[PDB]
Every structure is written in structure tokens, then in C-alpha cells.
């Protein structure tokens, strides 16, 4: 027995048919560390280590430690080994997560050598971090005082400190934290594992050290391997770390305790930060929340609840979701759904955008609706739709760019971490069949009504939360923090303050001084020869069906067909452009002459894997004419391809644009969505503003997704009551302008047998379309004026952007630009914008189709300081000495981004986009060879190209009113002020 000779006892072993894997549970004899080793033919290998880390306060220790362990370890004594992996590895996944009760460290890769490189850095980080040796990392990642000069105010700074101020300022994050903590006041979930900014400064390095000593011990660890690598070698890898420890009792300390269910419901009123120039009376929220049980529920109940959650909320047609939204009492759902990832399952439901006087009504509606579902039950067509949809997704197992092995780990860990069976959550074929059988034999009412009745309606463990906008909350919090720090300063002697100002300057210089290439040599990399000279092969065949371009990709898809039908919106009247996204929504959430929208949705849910309709807009390298499309993206079993294309035609051609009230609710939902895009994702808004000033593709998207769209939405509610017939006929001319056989493109991904069978369905679908669209043939120009702009929101944190067109310098695209851009992001901007500056993140974005090079920051306390960092990028590049090993790493890191692992639908889709944007296979290959040969000269050449962004680039910021005038007083009339 190889295992036992390496110190591991094999506990349990099963074949899981669901994931075609042999899964083995080992236990390290000496420490008791448990290892789930899952072998299969999946080349996207996955590793993770998870520690059970319940906090006992809101100081944020687990979260701070999660950041700190990745800042240097025994074998990797450099500032930030995590970023070195980000820079120079072929990973498919690289991250770290702090959950309320556990901290996870996962990596993935298709390349076995790369995989084991990543695994070693992670193992050494969590077990032998440098952050427990002295306080420096703790201070940087956690909290420290900063004083620029004894004459000035002291401030609090730190990665996690700043991150949590960001978080605690987003209304929806506030609500979910209030709910979790109010539901579970007597265990670890009653406190914040990420850290409350009011409490983070109470944390001492000593507490932080002890937390690591106790909890980051193999005895308290669970380890996951998944994939096609050698099973025995996994244990050999682990023995290096596991053998270096003795058994520890800490798992007895880390065990999570159940919250005993309340005997009476709880009612709470809480504040979130709001803007003053906004009608506060209208932006309340109401959420009702439950803890569903104390006992771990039987495995059939767990499945049945997940099914129930989908049945009530899975689609726009699902009754709870549908009834709440059509009430008109709110703008959108909030903190809604089942969550079962923690010890006890929790269900919540609520609305945001509720008027003050309607809050009791939302509560009454929620309760009435839930009672109605228990009493009347669910129609069998709804139940069949959920069952097909669910069975389809489990079979497809489409995790996107998230590894399948990681998704499995997280399912296993959700029970394993509470000392329950780690195999059980991986299984679903048998439980699902049994549920299906109960529904046929007893009916949905007998299956689902008792769950609603006893776990929800008759459950006194209920928390109701009303959230109210507070225009002063944020100012008052800044006031308390300032007064706290003024007393800190007042309590210090002149020399205490000189010492702190010196520690400040010392820290700033340390984090602005990169580790030299000599140091970074401890982190290994692949050879440039370990890298395929060719791109990932995707079988494309260009063909022709009913006078229409068709792309076929012959790939194993597990008997699923993926189709995209691409219509052109290049010549849509400009007045129609901003209505395109609501047009797409109307196709999917209105009925036909013959069917209601519920009946159509249920047909789609019963027969297919879903259909979506969305705009796509991009520049095309070499032309002024943009690629501007609406895409209808559908999937089904190959045997239901016929039903898929029938339903797509039904959506496209038969839906009637007559539902005024549903259209009004789309508007409100969209307004809600845009408003919190601005708040928590303003960098996407700035990027859109800037592109809109620079090219037609950019201007078009911003009409449909930026500031211009939000502005358009406000004009729209008057237009919907006063002139519905105008809106409806606009919707109808968009359809007329787009639905045509001529210049349509059809993308198909499925195995070769399915494709043949599918073409008959495609041919028939194409037959039913008009030949030519209505409207013009010309793509008419649009642009926003080039202006520096600042967009005002209520926030603590900003989002700062700068961009310009680097092709305008006469710089010509070379693949080295991809390498350099990635390097800029992970070195200069990482070090200055995030670490030194205090932003959650900073990065650059190169659109090689338009030539626009953009700088962006995310949740940034600064504004003009950030723009200054952006301007210094050319000198950084010019100042660089990059040895061959540095070049090699930057190259590998870019090739990893380019060779990123894709499931077959993503392959065929990426191939579609290359065709649309004119990227031929010989262009791909030429660009890859340019990537593989990037040199020091390239870095210097590129410096001169991006200096045009410094000299002639435009800045757009989404920021505080305070910071906008503060900056407009330092640089007079720099930013034009948009409210």
C-alpha cells in the first residue's frame, strides 16, 4: 500500500457516476488532515485547501489572514507570491475566499507542471507564511496608522480596512449582513468574518498570530484534489507539509454550533447610506428572512428545497418572483432566494425601491403569496419546466470559466466542513429520480406545501428587515472615525508623532520598491519551450444554408446543441438604439397572440436549456464600420433541436409588444440595476463613457449601457404612460430592422452527427424570416464630445479612468502589447493603485480592435493621485530592466490568458466572435508568435505609444461630490460635473 507508506489511511472510496470520477477519502494518520482525491479524465486539474476558521468577533481576522498568508512564505520570501503566480503561470483559476466559517485556497490548471508549481506556492503560503514572523504584513493587510506629517491628521489604512469600508457602503451588502447576523446571533455568523471597519483597529498582531497558530494547522484542514494527474503523487506532494506537524486539538475549537430557532419573529429597521439629491421617500427596502431548520435536513428535503427555490424564483415567470414584481410595490427583488452553503439553510425574499408608506404591504404580499403557493400549489407545466431545466443543467455542467472541479469541491466542502459526508452532496441522479417519482405519485402540493408550511409559514424563526435611506449615515461615520483619531494624536508626544511620520514614509517606500528580478527567481516558471506554438484547435467549418453564412464546430458536447443566431443592428435608427436592451427583455418576458408570457417561458423551460437575446458591439481592426449585433443564443438536447428553433422563431416573430405594465416594470428594474452599477462598479461606467468619446462601437454601447442609458431610462416612464403606442411601435420597428435572412449568421456547436440532424431545423428557421430587413443600409456616426468628466454618486470609494487611442500615434498592433499590458496591470498598477494607493484594484485594458488603451481603478479612495499614477506608466516601462526570466514569465502569463480553458460552447462562441471581428486563424497565429518573441525593446517601444494617453487621453471618474470639488479646486475646471 503506497498510501499507508506515505502516512495516509484510506477511509472511503466510491465511484461517482455523476462526475465520472473515482473519489477517495484519505486521512493523514499523524495529524488527522483529510484529503479528498478525485480522479477522472478532466484535464482542468483543481486543488484547494480549506481551513475551518470561525471568528468570535468582527475584527476581520480570517479575512486579514487570507490576504496576509499570500504575502511571503518560507520557500517564497518575496513581497507577494500570489501576484507572481498571477504574472507568470498558465493557471485556469487562481484565488482565495473567506466565507463566514471557512477560508478556501483553490488553484486550477490544464498543464500538470504548472499545476504543481501553483499547488506548492499555496501549500507553503498557508502553512509557513512570513506574516507571523513580524507585524509588517499584518499592518499593511490589516490596519495601521498613517501620518504624512505631525502637523496633519492621522488616518487608518490597510488593505482589508479599506476593502471593508467599500463593502459597508453598498446598500445590498449592508442588508445581507444585517440578515445573516440577525438570523444567527448566537454563533459565528452573528459576527462579520470579513471585518467591520469600526472594529478592525481593535485587532492586534498577537491575536492574528494565535488565530493562524490554532486554525491553519493540518488537523483543521481539508484538502481537495481533482483531475487527471497521478493520484499517488498528490499524497507525496502533501507529505512534505503534513509530516512537518504534530496532531492538534484545534478542530474541537473550530467546530460550528447550530443556532437554536427563535420562539418569536424579529422585526428590524436599519439605515443605509444615501444621496441627498434623491427622493428618499421612494428608496426603502423590505426583506423577510428565515432560518429553515436546526437539524440537518434529510437529503430528499434538501433537493426538494432547491427545486422549490427554482420553482418560486428561477425565472421571470416563477410565481413568487412574478407576483412580487408585478405588484408595482418595488423596483426589483433583493436578497432573495435559498442559501444552503452554511450550517443551517436560510431563505430570504424582499424588494428594493419601495415607498416608505408601502413597506407593510410588501410584507403582507410576501406572506399572502407564500400562503397561496402552499394552498393552491404549482401547476404541473411549471413543475415540468423546473424539472427539465434542472436536469438539463446538471447534465450539461456548464460552469463557464469556473473549473468543474472547483464547483464540485465547493459542493463537497459545504457538508464536509461541518463533519458530514463529503461524497453525498456530489450525488444527485438517485435523489432526483426519487423526487420525480414522488411528484408523479403524490402531486406537487403534497411534496412542496409541507415545506412551505412548516419551514417558512409556520416558522417563527423569521427576521423582517426594513432598510431606510440615510443621507447623513456616511458623514456621521467619518465624523466618529476622525474624532477617534484626533484623540489618538492628542495622546501622543511630539516624538511619538515624528516616529509615526517616519514609519509612514518608510512603509510608502517599501511598497513602492519592487522586489528585484534576482528575488523573484524563487518562484519557478515553465520553459518557453513547454508552450505549444499553436493556438487551441477549434474545428470550424464555414458553410451556407438558405443563402446564409453558417459556422459549424464539431465538438463533443454530450448530445447538446449550442446555437447562436446573429442579426445586424448596425443601421438601426439612433433614436432606437437605447431601446435595444428593453427590446431584448420584451422578446423574453411578453406573450404572443396565442400564449401568455408564462406559457411561452414554461415551453422554453420544458423543451430547451434556455434562450437569451442580447446586443453585442465592438470595433473591427482596420475599419471604421463597427460590428453591431443582436444575438439569439439557444441550447437544447440534440433531440429537441426542432423545438429549440421553433421556440426561437416564436420569440422573435410572434411575441407582441403590447404589455404596457410589464414594460413599466422592466424600466424600474433597469433603473435599479444601473443605479447600483454606478455605486459598486463605476469603473464599467467610466470605461463606457470614454469609449463613447473615442469610437462608434463605444458610443453605441454607452447608449445601451452607460450614463446615457440611465438618462434615457428616466425619460421613459413618462413616455410609457403618456405614449405607450409610440413605444410599442418603436419596439416593432427594431424587430422589422433586424429580423432578416440577409446578412444573418448562424453558429452551431455540437458533435458531427447532431450537426447534420440540426441543419434541417436551421434551414426551416431561416425560411420563416423575411429576406431583407426594413430601414436604412448605412451605419450613421455618433460620438460624445471629448471632455474630462466626473460623475457624482454617493460613495466613499471612487472609480478613476483614463484612455486614448494608441493607433493614432501610428503604433501598429504587435502581440507584445498583450504581454506588456498584462505586465503593467500586475506590477505598476498593482503596486501603486492597490497596495500603495489603497484601492481595491487598478488595471489597464487594451482593446486591440479599436486601439483604445484604458486605465481603470476599482473602489479607489483617491482621484487625481490615481491619474498621476496612470501618467507615470511610460517612465515605469522605460525604467525597467527585464531579464530573460522576467520576459519569459510575462509571456507565459499572457499565453495562459490566451490559451484559457474553455468548455465546447465557449470554444464555438469565441470562434464566432473571431469571425465577426475579422480575426483569421493566420492572424491568431501571427499574433501568438509575436507574443512568444516579445523582447525588452517592445517594452520601451510601447512606452511611447501609451504616453499619448498621458498627453492626449481623456479622464472620466465616478466619485464623491466632495472628491470632485476637492479635485476641481486643486486642478481648476479639470472635471466637467455630471450629476
Amino acid at each position: 500500500d503506497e498510501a499507508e507508506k506515505l502516512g495516509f489511511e484510506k477511509v472511503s472510496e466510491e465511484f461517482i457516476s455523476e462526475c465520472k470520477s473515482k473519489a477517495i477519502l484519505f486521512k493523514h494518520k499523524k495529524t488527522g488532515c483529510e484529503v479528498m482525491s478525485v480522479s477522472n479524465e478532466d484535464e482542468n486539474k483543481v486543488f484547494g485547501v480549506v481551513f475551518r476558521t470561525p471568528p468570535k468577533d468582527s475584527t476581520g481576522i480570517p479575512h486579514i489572514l487570507q490576504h496576509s498568508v499570500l504575502c511571503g512564505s518560507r520557500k517564497y520570501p518575496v513581497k507577494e507570491p500570489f501576484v507572481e503566480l498571477l504574472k507568470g503561470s498558465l493557471h485556469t483559476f487562481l484565488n482565495a475566499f473567506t466565507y463566514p466559517d471557512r477560508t478556501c485556497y483553490p488553484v486550477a490548471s490544464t498543464n500538470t507542471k504548472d499545476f504543481y508549481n501553483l499547488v506548492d506556492v499555496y501549500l507553503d503560503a498557508v502553512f509557513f507564511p512570513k506574516c507571523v514572523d513580524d507585524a509588517h504584513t499584518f499592518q499593511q493587510e490589516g490596519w495601521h496608522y498613517e501620518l504624512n506629517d505631525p502637523s496633519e491628521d492621522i488616518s487608518y489604512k490597510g488593505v482589508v480596512f479599506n476593502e471593508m469600508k467599500g463593502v459597508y457602503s453598498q446598500p445590498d451588502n449592508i442588508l445581507g449582513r444585517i440578515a445573516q447576523q440577525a438570523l444567527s446571533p448566537e454563533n459565528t455568523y452573528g459576527v462579520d468574518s470579513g471585518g467591520d471597519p469600526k472594529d478592525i483597529p481593535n485587532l492586534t498582531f498577537e491575536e492574528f498570530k494565535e488565530f493562524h497558530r490554532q486554525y491553519y494547522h493540518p488537523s483543521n484542514a481539508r484538502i481537495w484534489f481533482y483531475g487527471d494527474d497521478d493520484p499517488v503523487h498528490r499524497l507525496r506532494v502533501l507529505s512534505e507539509y503534513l509530516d512537518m506537524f504534530e496532531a492538534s486539538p484545534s478542530p474541537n475549537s473550530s467546530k460550528i454550533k447550530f443556532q437554536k430557532l427563535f420562539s418569536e419573529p424579529v422585526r428590524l429597521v436599519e439605515k443605509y447610506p444615501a444621496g441627498r439629491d434623491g427622493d428618499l421617500k421612494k428608496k426603502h427596502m423590505l426583506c423577510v428572512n428565515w432560518l429553515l431548520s436546526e437539524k440537518p435536513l434529510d437529503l430528499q428535503t434538501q433537493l426538494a428545497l432547491g427545486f422549490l427555490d427554482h420553482l418560486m424564483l428561477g425565472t421571470p415567470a416563477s410565481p413568487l418572483r412574478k407576483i412580487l414584481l408585478e405588484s408595482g410595490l418595488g423596483e426589483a427583488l433583493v436578497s432573495s432566494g435559498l442559501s444552503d452553503e452554511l450550517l443551517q439553510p436560510q431563505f430570504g425574499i424582499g424588494l428594493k425601491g419601495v415607498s416608505e408608506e408601502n413597506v407593510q404591504k410588501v410584507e403582507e404580499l410576501i406572506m399572502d403569496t407564500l400562503k397561496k403557493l402552499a394552498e393552491e400549489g404549482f401547476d404541473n407545466d411549471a413543475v415540468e419546466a423546473s424539472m427539465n431545466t434542472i436536469e438539463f443543467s446538471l447534465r450539461e455542467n456548464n460552469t463557464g470559466s469556473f473549473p468543474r472541479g472547483l464547483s464540485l469541491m465547493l459542493q463537497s466542502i459545504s457538508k464536509w466542513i461541518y463533519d458530514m459526508d463529503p461524497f453525498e452532496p456530489l450525488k444527485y441522479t438517485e435523489p432526483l429520480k426519487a423526487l420525480k417519482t414522488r411528484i408523479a405519485e403524490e402531486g406537487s402540493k403534497a411534496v412542496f406545501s409541507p415545506l412551505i408550511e412548516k419551514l417558512i409559514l409556520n416558522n417563527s424563526h423569521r427576521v423582517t428587515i426594513e432598510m431606510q435611506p440615510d443621507p447623513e449615515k456616511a458623514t456621521q461615520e467619518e465624523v466618529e472615525e476622525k474624532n477617534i483619531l484626533e484623540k489618538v494624536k492628542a495622546a501622543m508626544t511630539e516624538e511619538d508623532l515624528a516616529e509615526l511620520a517616519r514609519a509612514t514614509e518608510e512603509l510608502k517606500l517599501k511598497q513602492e520598491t519592487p522586489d528585484p528580478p534576482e528575488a523573484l527567481r524563487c518562484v519557478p516558471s515553465l520553459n518557453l519551450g513547454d508552450i505549444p506554438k499553436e493556438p487551441t484547435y477549434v474545428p470550424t467549418e464555414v458553410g451556407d444554408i438558405n443563402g446564409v453564412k453558417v459556422l459549424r464546430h464539431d465538438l463533443f458536447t454530450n448530445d447538446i446543441i449550442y446555437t447562436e443566431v446573429v442579426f445586424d443592428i448596425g443601421s438601426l435608427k439612433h433614436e432606437l438604439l437605447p431601446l435595444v436592451p428593453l427590446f431584448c427583455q420584451s422578446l423574453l418576458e411578453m406573450g404572443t397572440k396565442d400564449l401568455t408570457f408564462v406559457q411561452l417561458n414554461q415551453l422554453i423551460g420544458r423543451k430547451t436549456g434556455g434562450i437569451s437575446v442580447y446586443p453585442l458591439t465592438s470595433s473591427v481592426r482596420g475599419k471604421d464600420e463597427p460590428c453591431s449585433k443582436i444575438i439569439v443564443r439557444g441550447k437544447s438536447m440534440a433531440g429537441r433541436a426542432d423545438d429549440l428553433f421553433n421556440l426561437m422563431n416564436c420569440l422573435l416573430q410572434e411575441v407582441q409588444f403590447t404589455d404596457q405594465q410589464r414594460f413599466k416594470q422592466f424600466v424600474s428594474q433597469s433603473r435599479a440595476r444601473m443605479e447600483n452599477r454606478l455605486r459598486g462598479s463605476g469603473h464599467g461606467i467610466a470605461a463606457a463613457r470614454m469609449d463613447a468619446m473615442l469610437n462608434i462601437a463605444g458610443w453605441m454601447s454607452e447608449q445601451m449601457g452607460g450614463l446615457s442609458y440611465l438618462e434615457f431610462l428616466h425619460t421613459l416612464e413618462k413616455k410609457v404612460d403618456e405614449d405607450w403606442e409610440g413605444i410599442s411601435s418603436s419596439l416593432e420597428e427594431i424587430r422589422r430592422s433586424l429580423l432578416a435572412r440577409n446578412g444573418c449568421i448562424v453558429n452551431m456547436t455540437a458533435d458531427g452527427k447532431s450537426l447534420t440532424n440540426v441543419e434541417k431545423s436551421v434551414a426551416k428557421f431561416l425560411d420563416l424570416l423575411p429576406e431583407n430587413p426594413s430601414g436604412g443600409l448605412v451605419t450613421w456616426d455618433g460620438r460624445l464630445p471629448l471632455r474630462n468628466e466626473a460623475i457624482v454618486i454617493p460613495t466613499q470609494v471612487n472609480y478613476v479612468g483614463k484612455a486614448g487611442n494608441i493607433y493614432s500615434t501610428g503604433y501598429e498592433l504587435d502581440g507584445s502589447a498583450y504581454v506588456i499590458s498584462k505586465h503593467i496591470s500586475n506590477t505598476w498598477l498593482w503596486d501603486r493603485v492597490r497596495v500603495s494607493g489603497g484601492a481595491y484594484g487598478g488595471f489597464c485594458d487594451f482593446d486591440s480592435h479599436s486601439g483604445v488603451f484604458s486605465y481603470l481603478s476599482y473602489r479607489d479612495p483617491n482621484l487625481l493621485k490615481t491619474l498621476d499614477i496612470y501618467d507615470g506608466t511610460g517612465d515605469f516601462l522605460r525604467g525597467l530592466d527585464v531579464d530573460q526570466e522576467t520576459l519569459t514569465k510575462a509571456i507565459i502569463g499572457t499565453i495562459g490568458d490566451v490559451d484559457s480553458y474553455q468548455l465546447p460552447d465557449a470554444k464555438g462562441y469565441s470562434s464566432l466572435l473571431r469571425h465577426l471581428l475579422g480575426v483569421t486563424d493566420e492572424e491568431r497565429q501571427r499574433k501568438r508568435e509575436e507574443i512568444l518573441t516579445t523582447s525588452l525593446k517592445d517594452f520601451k517601444d510601447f512606452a511611447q505609444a501609451i504616453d499619448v494617453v498621458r498627453d492626449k487621453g481623456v479622464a472620466v471618474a465616478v466619485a464623491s461630490a466632495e472628491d470632485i470639488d476637492a479635485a476641481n479646486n486643486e486642478r481648476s475646471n479639470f472635471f466637467e460635473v455630471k450629476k
Binding site: 487562481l94 463566514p100 445581507g176
Partner: peptide, 6 residues
């Protein structure tokens, strides 16, 4: 909850 590094 889930708080990430990158």
C-alpha cells in the same frame, strides 16, 4: 458571503 483576494 465570499470575500476574494483578486
Amino acid at each position: 458571503a465570499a470575500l476574494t483576494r483578486a
